[PDB]
Subunit: 121 residues, 4 copies
Amino acid sequence: AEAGITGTWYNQLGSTFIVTAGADGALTGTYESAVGNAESRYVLTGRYDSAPATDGSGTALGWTVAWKNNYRNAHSATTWSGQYVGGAEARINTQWLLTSGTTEANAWKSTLVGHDTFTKV
Amino acid sequence: AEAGITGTWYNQLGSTFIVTAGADGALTGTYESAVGNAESRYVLTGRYDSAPATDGSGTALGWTVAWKNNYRNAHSATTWSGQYVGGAEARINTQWLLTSGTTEANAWKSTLVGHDTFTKVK
Amino acid sequence: AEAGITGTWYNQLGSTFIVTAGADGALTGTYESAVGNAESRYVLTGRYDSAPATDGSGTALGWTVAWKNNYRNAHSATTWSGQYVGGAEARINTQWLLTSGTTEANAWKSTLVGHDTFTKVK
Amino acid sequence: AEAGITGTWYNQLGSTFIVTAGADGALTGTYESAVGNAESRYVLTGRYDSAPATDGSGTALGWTVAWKNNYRNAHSATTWSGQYVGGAEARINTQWLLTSGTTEANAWKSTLVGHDTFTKV
Ligand SMILES: [N+][Cl-]
Ligand SMILES: [N+][Cl-]
Ligand SMILES: [Cl-]
Ligand SMILES: [Cl-]
Ligand code: NA
Ligand code: NA
């Protein structure tokens, strides 16, 4: 739990996530995607449970990435919510929501949902 | 626009969201929830599009709150994903995911999903 | 209760839902959507709890509509999951998932999520 | 596409899904779970695109299971939305919503979301 979150992670699509977990619950780093209207790294900020477990539970966390950087602006943001599980093969299992900024007319179709699993391999 | 988002907002459950949108696309503030095993204010951090479209499109944003503060720890975290819509009655419409830490065994039932609409007070 | 669910309902987008709750927990009917690449009525099939709690709890139910009829085919399907709440103003509050057929490549962006509230007309 | 959906499928949790896909878009069969307040088989009903693709796309489908049978009544229902992909290893990739019937007070926490992948192995 805790510390172990810090590092570089990868998901099934090939995106790379580099985070630093601060002693008091903060998550900071950058996200470089593999899919979408994304081009380079984007900043990410999140929060995690700095005091999880002690039944074998994972550490709840979440983070956001607005898809705007110096090269692209997709006018969308993705939030990932999930939990970290350490061990010989640590992983972060997540479900995410991607909302695009639409006009009212298209508001009903503004959010996509998916799931991503990150490993350090 | 940072300015339109900065403020105090409330949702249909009676929770309070105090946020500051920074120039670099950052969102920081505190959240006071009306439901859950929550007690006091919790810190929030998020991001938004500081350069949205010039179209009456909303401004996409998102934020996270881990439900642990000096008084309580619920071992869970919620992320809200949605868009800010300004005008005379500005709203932030979101969909959220609340994940609880669990054992591998109960992981299938670790995430709740819902939706909240926030109204700005000013 | 089958009876309270049977009827014509409308949601905030202007779509029509005509359903019949059968005694065995089945839901059949048609859906007329206001949005999407939809044209005419589409068939729906679902299930509900024919024996809910005796608690002012809602009655859980869910249904599916594949967006293909004799006039149009959108290669997508939506499932709504929610509960029926009876009273003077009966509502069915749902959360939905709309999945489109895609190539492995775009599969990550194949599902949309939202929420609809239906009001019964009678 | 089409036909290939008919059969017995299994997901990662061990639940078994037995469906029949009808020529015009119907899905009928039974679901026997591995998790929850479930006990035996439950009836399922759904719909699928009987005319998908012709770019290599999967077949969109969805189905519902109300968790009430002659032995248990969990006062909940689950809907799975996803697409079928055939081939040497056919699979159905889904995201699901599980709603329990609550009082208004707990309505905010009535729906769980997850994802399941079914294979015939
Ligand atoms: N999403 Cl990645
Ligand atoms: N859920 Cl299976
Ligand atoms: Cl809240
Ligand atoms: Cl609709
Ligand atoms: Na809340
Ligand atoms: Na609709």
